[PDB]
Amino acid sequence: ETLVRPKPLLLKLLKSVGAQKDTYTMKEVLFYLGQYIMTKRLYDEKQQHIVYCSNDLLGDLFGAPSFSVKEHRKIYTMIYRNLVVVN
Amino acid sequence: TSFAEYWXXX
């Protein structure tokens, strides 16, 4: 229920797993980002809420080597820092 | 519990 236009690095990540748009819903971006993590196997195989992204485009986007899916605030914040909201 | 299940409480 928010239309967003990803900035270039986030868009590159979405296009890496086949996104073809300029404008997305926030929900849509979240699903593509999860698809990116699964397609690239960035999750820890034993404790799959851990994402290690240090030598990956996702790490540049988040500015950190790793994060937990439990860090809701951190994940939302990083996404919003990389998009333009369509008011 | 898969990453997909963790992601789908984002």
mmCIF file of N, CA and C in Angstrom:
data_model
loop_
_atom_site.group_PDB
_atom_site.id
_atom_site.type_symbol
_atom_site.label_atom_id
_atom_site.label_comp_id
_atom_site.label_asym_id
_atom_site.label_seq_id
_atom_site.Cartn_x
_atom_site.Cartn_y
_atom_site.Cartn_z
ATOM 1 N N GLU A 1 0.826 -1.199 0.000
ATOM 2 C CA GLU A 1 0.000 0.000 0.000
ATOM 3 C C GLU A 1 0.868 1.259 0.000
ATOM 4 N N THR A 2 2.135 1.090 -0.353
ATOM 5 C CA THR A 2 3.011 2.201 -0.695
ATOM 6 C C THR A 2 3.640 1.883 -2.036
ATOM 7 N N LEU A 3 3.587 2.822 -2.977
ATOM 8 C CA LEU A 3 4.273 2.621 -4.245
ATOM 9 C C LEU A 3 5.648 3.243 -4.118
ATOM 10 N N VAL A 4 6.659 2.484 -4.512
ATOM 11 C CA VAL A 4 8.047 2.889 -4.368
ATOM 12 C C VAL A 4 8.777 2.694 -5.687
ATOM 13 N N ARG A 5 9.804 3.507 -5.879
ATOM 14 C CA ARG A 5 10.703 3.393 -7.020
ATOM 15 C C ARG A 5 12.088 3.131 -6.441
ATOM 16 N N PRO A 6 12.598 1.894 -6.512
ATOM 17 C CA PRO A 6 13.943 1.604 -5.978
ATOM 18 C C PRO A 6 15.028 2.427 -6.649
ATOM 19 N N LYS A 7 15.963 2.899 -5.833
ATOM 20 C CA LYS A 7 17.158 3.574 -6.307
ATOM 21 C C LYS A 7 18.070 2.541 -6.968
ATOM 22 N N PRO A 8 19.111 2.977 -7.704
ATOM 23 C CA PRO A 8 19.834 2.035 -8.584
ATOM 24 C C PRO A 8 20.404 0.777 -7.939
ATOM 25 N N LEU A 9 21.020 0.841 -6.749
ATOM 26 C CA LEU A 9 21.606 -0.376 -6.191
ATOM 27 C C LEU A 9 20.528 -1.371 -5.781
ATOM 28 N N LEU A 10 19.467 -0.898 -5.117
ATOM 29 C CA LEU A 10 18.373 -1.800 -4.775
ATOM 30 C C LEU A 10 17.742 -2.384 -6.036
ATOM 31 N N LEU A 11 17.553 -1.558 -7.064
ATOM 32 C CA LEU A 11 16.985 -2.061 -8.312
ATOM 33 C C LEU A 11 17.868 -3.130 -8.943
ATOM 34 N N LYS A 12 19.191 -2.936 -8.908
ATOM 35 C CA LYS A 12 20.104 -3.960 -9.413
ATOM 36 C C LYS A 12 19.892 -5.286 -8.698
ATOM 37 N N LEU A 13 19.715 -5.241 -7.381
ATOM 38 C CA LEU A 13 19.426 -6.454 -6.628
ATOM 39 C C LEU A 13 18.114 -7.100 -7.081
ATOM 40 N N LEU A 14 17.058 -6.303 -7.241
ATOM 41 C CA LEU A 14 15.780 -6.869 -7.691
ATOM 42 C C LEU A 14 15.883 -7.431 -9.106
ATOM 43 N N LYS A 15 16.596 -6.735 -9.992
ATOM 44 C CA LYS A 15 16.747 -7.223 -11.358
ATOM 45 C C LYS A 15 17.626 -8.464 -11.434
ATOM 46 N N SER A 16 18.459 -8.703 -10.412
ATOM 47 C CA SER A 16 19.266 -9.918 -10.355
ATOM 48 C C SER A 16 18.407 -11.161 -10.245
ATOM 49 N N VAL A 17 17.203 -11.047 -9.683
ATOM 50 C CA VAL A 17 16.303 -12.190 -9.596
ATOM 51 C C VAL A 17 15.080 -12.001 -10.485
ATOM 52 N N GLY A 18 15.201 -11.168 -11.516
ATOM 53 C CA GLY A 18 14.218 -11.115 -12.578
ATOM 54 C C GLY A 18 13.166 -10.027 -12.508
ATOM 55 N N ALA A 19 13.256 -9.091 -11.568
ATOM 56 C CA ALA A 19 12.299 -7.988 -11.572
ATOM 57 C C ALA A 19 12.423 -7.168 -12.852
ATOM 58 N N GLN A 20 11.284 -6.686 -13.353
ATOM 59 C CA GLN A 20 11.245 -5.997 -14.638
ATOM 60 C C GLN A 20 10.590 -4.623 -14.538
ATOM 61 N N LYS A 21 10.443 -4.062 -13.340
ATOM 62 C CA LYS A 21 9.658 -2.842 -13.215
ATOM 63 C C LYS A 21 10.480 -1.649 -12.755
ATOM 64 N N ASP A 22 9.827 -0.498 -12.823
ATOM 65 C CA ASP A 22 10.362 0.713 -12.237
ATOM 66 C C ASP A 22 9.734 0.992 -10.894
ATOM 67 N N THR A 23 8.485 0.590 -10.741
ATOM 68 C CA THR A 23 7.672 0.924 -9.588
ATOM 69 C C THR A 23 7.096 -0.354 -9.023
ATOM 70 N N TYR A 24 7.085 -0.438 -7.700
ATOM 71 C CA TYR A 24 6.713 -1.638 -6.976
ATOM 72 C C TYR A 24 5.860 -1.219 -5.792
ATOM 73 N N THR A 25 5.112 -2.166 -5.239
ATOM 74 C CA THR A 25 4.640 -1.951 -3.882
ATOM 75 C C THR A 25 5.753 -2.313 -2.898
ATOM 76 N N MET A 26 5.636 -1.791 -1.677
ATOM 77 C CA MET A 26 6.569 -2.175 -0.620
ATOM 78 C C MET A 26 6.545 -3.678 -0.372
ATOM 79 N N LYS A 27 5.356 -4.273 -0.355
ATOM 80 C CA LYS A 27 5.254 -5.718 -0.194
ATOM 81 C C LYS A 27 6.006 -6.448 -1.304
ATOM 82 N N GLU A 28 5.853 -5.974 -2.542
ATOM 83 C CA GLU A 28 6.501 -6.579 -3.702
ATOM 84 C C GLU A 28 8.019 -6.574 -3.556
ATOM 85 N N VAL A 29 8.578 -5.430 -3.152
ATOM 86 C CA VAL A 29 10.022 -5.315 -2.935
ATOM 87 C C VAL A 29 10.478 -6.291 -1.861
ATOM 88 N N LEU A 30 9.704 -6.409 -0.778
ATOM 89 C CA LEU A 30 10.091 -7.312 0.298
ATOM 90 C C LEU A 30 10.148 -8.744 -0.194
ATOM 91 N N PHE A 31 9.193 -9.131 -1.042
ATOM 92 C CA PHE A 31 9.195 -10.491 -1.582
ATOM 93 C C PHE A 31 10.369 -10.719 -2.530
ATOM 94 N N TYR A 32 10.669 -9.738 -3.395
ATOM 95 C CA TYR A 32 11.827 -9.858 -4.279
ATOM 96 C C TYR A 32 13.123 -9.954 -3.486
ATOM 97 N N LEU A 33 13.250 -9.175 -2.409
ATOM 98 C CA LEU A 33 14.468 -9.218 -1.598
ATOM 99 C C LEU A 33 14.637 -10.575 -0.923
ATOM 100 N N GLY A 34 13.550 -11.139 -0.409
ATOM 101 C CA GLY A 34 13.628 -12.490 0.114
ATOM 102 C C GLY A 34 14.022 -13.495 -0.951
ATOM 103 N N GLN A 35 13.433 -13.368 -2.144
ATOM 104 C CA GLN A 35 13.807 -14.219 -3.270
ATOM 105 C C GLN A 35 15.284 -14.076 -3.608
ATOM 106 N N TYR A 36 15.811 -12.854 -3.536
ATOM 107 C CA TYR A 36 17.234 -12.647 -3.775
ATOM 108 C C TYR A 36 18.067 -13.431 -2.765
ATOM 109 N N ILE A 37 17.712 -13.339 -1.481
ATOM 110 C CA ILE A 37 18.456 -14.035 -0.431
ATOM 111 C C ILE A 37 18.396 -15.553 -0.621
ATOM 112 N N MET A 38 17.233 -16.084 -1.021
ATOM 113 C CA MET A 38 17.119 -17.526 -1.207
ATOM 114 C C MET A 38 17.847 -17.986 -2.460
ATOM 115 N N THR A 39 17.677 -17.258 -3.563
ATOM 116 C CA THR A 39 18.337 -17.624 -4.807
ATOM 117 C C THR A 39 19.853 -17.596 -4.647
ATOM 118 N N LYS A 40 20.365 -16.646 -3.870
ATOM 119 C CA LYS A 40 21.797 -16.568 -3.628
ATOM 120 C C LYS A 40 22.254 -17.380 -2.429
ATOM 121 N N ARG A 41 21.341 -18.044 -1.712
ATOM 122 C CA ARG A 41 21.698 -18.849 -0.536
ATOM 123 C C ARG A 41 22.510 -18.040 0.483
ATOM 124 N N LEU A 42 22.064 -16.807 0.748
ATOM 125 C CA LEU A 42 22.693 -15.928 1.728
ATOM 126 C C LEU A 42 22.279 -16.248 3.157
ATOM 127 N N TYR A 43 21.265 -17.090 3.347
ATOM 128 C CA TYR A 43 20.845 -17.500 4.681
ATOM 129 C C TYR A 43 21.750 -18.612 5.213
ATOM 130 N N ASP A 44 21.906 -18.654 6.538
ATOM 131 C CA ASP A 44 22.660 -19.736 7.161
ATOM 132 C C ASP A 44 21.868 -21.038 7.086
ATOM 133 N N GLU A 45 22.523 -22.130 6.677
ATOM 134 C CA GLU A 45 21.762 -23.350 6.424
ATOM 135 C C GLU A 45 21.225 -23.968 7.710
ATOM 136 N N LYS A 46 21.886 -23.737 8.848
ATOM 137 C CA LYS A 46 21.447 -24.331 10.107
ATOM 138 C C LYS A 46 20.441 -23.456 10.852
ATOM 139 N N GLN A 47 20.708 -22.157 10.958
ATOM 140 C CA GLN A 47 19.814 -21.206 11.624
ATOM 141 C C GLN A 47 19.398 -20.192 10.575
ATOM 142 N N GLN A 48 18.305 -20.479 9.874
ATOM 143 C CA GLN A 48 18.037 -19.802 8.619
ATOM 144 C C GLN A 48 17.517 -18.382 8.797
ATOM 145 N N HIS A 49 17.376 -17.879 10.029
ATOM 146 C CA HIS A 49 17.067 -16.459 10.175
ATOM 147 C C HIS A 49 18.308 -15.577 10.072
ATOM 148 N N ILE A 50 19.497 -16.170 10.015
ATOM 149 C CA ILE A 50 20.749 -15.429 9.905
ATOM 150 C C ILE A 50 21.068 -15.241 8.428
ATOM 151 N N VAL A 51 21.375 -14.007 8.038
ATOM 152 C CA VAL A 51 21.806 -13.695 6.683
ATOM 153 C C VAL A 51 23.217 -13.131 6.759
ATOM 154 N N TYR A 52 24.165 -13.793 6.097
ATOM 155 C CA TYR A 52 25.537 -13.306 5.981
ATOM 156 C C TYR A 52 25.744 -12.764 4.574
ATOM 157 N N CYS A 53 26.051 -11.476 4.479
ATOM 158 C CA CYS A 53 26.004 -10.782 3.198
ATOM 159 C C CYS A 53 27.261 -9.958 2.960
ATOM 160 N N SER A 54 28.360 -10.277 3.656
ATOM 161 C CA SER A 54 29.518 -9.384 3.695
ATOM 162 C C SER A 54 30.160 -9.179 2.327
ATOM 163 N N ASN A 55 30.281 -10.232 1.527
ATOM 164 C CA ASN A 55 30.916 -10.045 0.227
ATOM 165 C C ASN A 55 29.861 -10.101 -0.865
ATOM 166 N N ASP A 56 28.769 -9.376 -0.661
ATOM 167 C CA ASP A 56 27.649 -9.400 -1.585
ATOM 168 C C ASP A 56 27.085 -8.001 -1.735
ATOM 169 N N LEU A 57 26.438 -7.782 -2.879
ATOM 170 C CA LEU A 57 25.702 -6.548 -3.123
ATOM 171 C C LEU A 57 24.760 -6.204 -1.973
ATOM 172 N N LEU A 58 24.137 -7.221 -1.365
ATOM 173 C CA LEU A 58 23.211 -6.980 -0.256
ATOM 174 C C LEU A 58 23.911 -6.347 0.942
ATOM 175 N N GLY A 59 25.156 -6.747 1.204
ATOM 176 C CA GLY A 59 25.919 -6.128 2.276
ATOM 177 C C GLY A 59 26.219 -4.658 2.037
ATOM 178 N N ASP A 60 26.532 -4.289 0.789
ATOM 179 C CA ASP A 60 26.698 -2.874 0.456
ATOM 180 C C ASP A 60 25.413 -2.106 0.690
ATOM 181 N N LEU A 61 24.293 -2.689 0.272
ATOM 182 C CA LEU A 61 22.991 -2.070 0.466
ATOM 183 C C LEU A 61 22.707 -1.846 1.944
ATOM 184 N N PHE A 62 22.992 -2.846 2.783
ATOM 185 C CA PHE A 62 22.700 -2.732 4.204
ATOM 186 C C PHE A 62 23.840 -2.111 5.000
ATOM 187 N N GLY A 63 25.048 -2.075 4.451
ATOM 188 C CA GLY A 63 26.156 -1.472 5.168
ATOM 189 C C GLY A 63 26.602 -2.281 6.359
ATOM 190 N N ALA A 64 26.452 -3.598 6.298
ATOM 191 C CA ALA A 64 26.786 -4.463 7.413
ATOM 192 C C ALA A 64 27.120 -5.831 6.848
ATOM 193 N N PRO A 65 27.911 -6.632 7.562
ATOM 194 C CA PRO A 65 28.267 -7.951 7.029
ATOM 195 C C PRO A 65 27.188 -8.999 7.225
ATOM 196 N N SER A 66 26.218 -8.745 8.093
ATOM 197 C CA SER A 66 25.261 -9.767 8.486
ATOM 198 C C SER A 66 24.068 -9.097 9.140
ATOM 199 N N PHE A 67 22.949 -9.821 9.187
ATOM 200 C CA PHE A 67 21.773 -9.369 9.915
ATOM 201 C C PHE A 67 20.886 -10.571 10.181
ATOM 202 N N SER A 68 19.958 -10.397 11.125
ATOM 203 C CA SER A 68 18.927 -11.386 11.414
ATOM 204 C C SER A 68 17.598 -10.913 10.846
ATOM 205 N N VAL A 69 16.828 -11.859 10.292
ATOM 206 C CA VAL A 69 15.473 -11.577 9.831
ATOM 207 C C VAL A 69 14.614 -11.042 10.964
ATOM 208 N N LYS A 70 15.020 -11.284 12.207
ATOM 209 C CA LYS A 70 14.291 -10.744 13.342
ATOM 210 C C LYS A 70 14.458 -9.234 13.467
ATOM 211 N N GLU A 71 15.453 -8.651 12.802
ATOM 212 C CA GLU A 71 15.696 -7.206 12.889
ATOM 213 C C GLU A 71 14.795 -6.444 11.911
ATOM 214 N N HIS A 72 13.493 -6.518 12.203
ATOM 215 C CA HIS A 72 12.455 -5.877 11.397
ATOM 216 C C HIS A 72 12.765 -4.405 11.135
ATOM 217 N N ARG A 73 13.096 -3.662 12.188
ATOM 218 C CA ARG A 73 13.329 -2.227 12.039
ATOM 219 C C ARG A 73 14.513 -1.959 11.120
ATOM 220 N N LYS A 74 15.598 -2.720 11.290
ATOM 221 C CA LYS A 74 16.786 -2.530 10.468
ATOM 222 C C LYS A 74 16.516 -2.851 9.005
ATOM 223 N N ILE A 75 15.747 -3.906 8.738
ATOM 224 C CA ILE A 75 15.478 -4.282 7.357
ATOM 225 C C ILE A 75 14.580 -3.250 6.680
ATOM 226 N N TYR A 76 13.520 -2.814 7.367
ATOM 227 C CA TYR A 76 12.660 -1.780 6.792
ATOM 228 C C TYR A 76 13.432 -0.495 6.544
ATOM 229 N N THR A 77 14.236 -0.076 7.524
ATOM 230 C CA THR A 77 14.997 1.159 7.391
ATOM 231 C C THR A 77 15.917 1.123 6.183
ATOM 232 N N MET A 78 16.658 0.024 6.010
ATOM 233 C CA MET A 78 17.564 -0.061 4.873
ATOM 234 C C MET A 78 16.805 -0.010 3.558
ATOM 235 N N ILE A 79 15.654 -0.679 3.477
ATOM 236 C CA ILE A 79 14.890 -0.617 2.233
ATOM 237 C C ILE A 79 14.433 0.810 1.955
ATOM 238 N N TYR A 80 13.874 1.491 2.968
ATOM 239 C CA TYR A 80 13.397 2.857 2.764
ATOM 240 C C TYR A 80 14.527 3.804 2.408
ATOM 241 N N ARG A 81 15.722 3.574 2.943
ATOM 242 C CA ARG A 81 16.837 4.431 2.567
ATOM 243 C C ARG A 81 17.240 4.260 1.108
ATOM 244 N N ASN A 82 16.743 3.228 0.434
ATOM 245 C CA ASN A 82 17.143 2.932 -0.934
ATOM 246 C C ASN A 82 15.995 3.017 -1.926
ATOM 247 N N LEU A 83 14.956 3.772 -1.603
ATOM 248 C CA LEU A 83 13.844 3.922 -2.521
ATOM 249 C C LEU A 83 13.312 5.343 -2.456
ATOM 250 N N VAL A 84 12.533 5.689 -3.471
ATOM 251 C CA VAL A 84 11.769 6.926 -3.492
ATOM 252 C C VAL A 84 10.303 6.546 -3.392
ATOM 253 N N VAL A 85 9.613 7.134 -2.425
ATOM 254 C CA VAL A 85 8.185 6.908 -2.229
ATOM 255 C C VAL A 85 7.389 7.689 -3.266
ATOM 256 N N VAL A 86 6.383 7.050 -3.858
ATOM 257 C CA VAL A 86 5.495 7.727 -4.799
ATOM 258 C C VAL A 86 4.287 8.206 -3.995
ATOM 259 N N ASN A 87 4.317 9.463 -3.547
ATOM 260 C CA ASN A 87 3.166 10.042 -2.837
ATOM 261 C C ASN A 87 1.957 10.083 -3.765
ATOM 262 N N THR B 1 12.905 -24.635 10.637
ATOM 263 C CA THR B 1 12.249 -23.428 10.137
ATOM 264 C C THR B 1 13.080 -22.765 9.055
ATOM 265 N N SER B 2 12.520 -22.739 7.851
ATOM 266 C CA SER B 2 13.203 -22.221 6.677
ATOM 267 C C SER B 2 13.307 -20.699 6.733
ATOM 268 N N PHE B 3 14.297 -20.174 6.010
ATOM 269 C CA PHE B 3 14.369 -18.740 5.771
ATOM 270 C C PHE B 3 13.059 -18.216 5.184
ATOM 271 N N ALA B 4 12.465 -18.960 4.241
ATOM 272 C CA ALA B 4 11.213 -18.523 3.638
ATOM 273 C C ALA B 4 10.128 -18.327 4.692
ATOM 274 N N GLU B 5 10.060 -19.224 5.675
ATOM 275 C CA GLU B 5 9.070 -19.083 6.735
ATOM 276 C C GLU B 5 9.401 -17.909 7.652
ATOM 277 N N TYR B 6 10.689 -17.694 7.953
ATOM 278 C CA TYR B 6 11.058 -16.521 8.743
ATOM 279 C C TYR B 6 10.704 -15.235 8.020
ATOM 280 N N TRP B 7 10.988 -15.174 6.720
ATOM 281 C CA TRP B 7 10.813 -13.956 5.975
ATOM 282 C C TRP B 7 9.315 -13.612 5.825
ATOM 283 N N UNK B 8 8.515 -14.600 5.388
ATOM 284 C CA UNK B 8 7.152 -14.400 4.896
ATOM 285 C C UNK B 8 6.264 -14.070 7.827
ATOM 286 N N UNK B 9 6.724 -14.039 9.086
ATOM 287 C CA UNK B 9 6.405 -12.942 10.005
ATOM 288 C C UNK B 9 8.498 -10.590 8.837
ATOM 289 N N UNK B 10 9.111 -10.407 7.657
ATOM 290 C CA UNK B 10 9.323 -9.063 7.117
ATOM 291 C C UNK B 10 6.247 -8.613 7.229
#
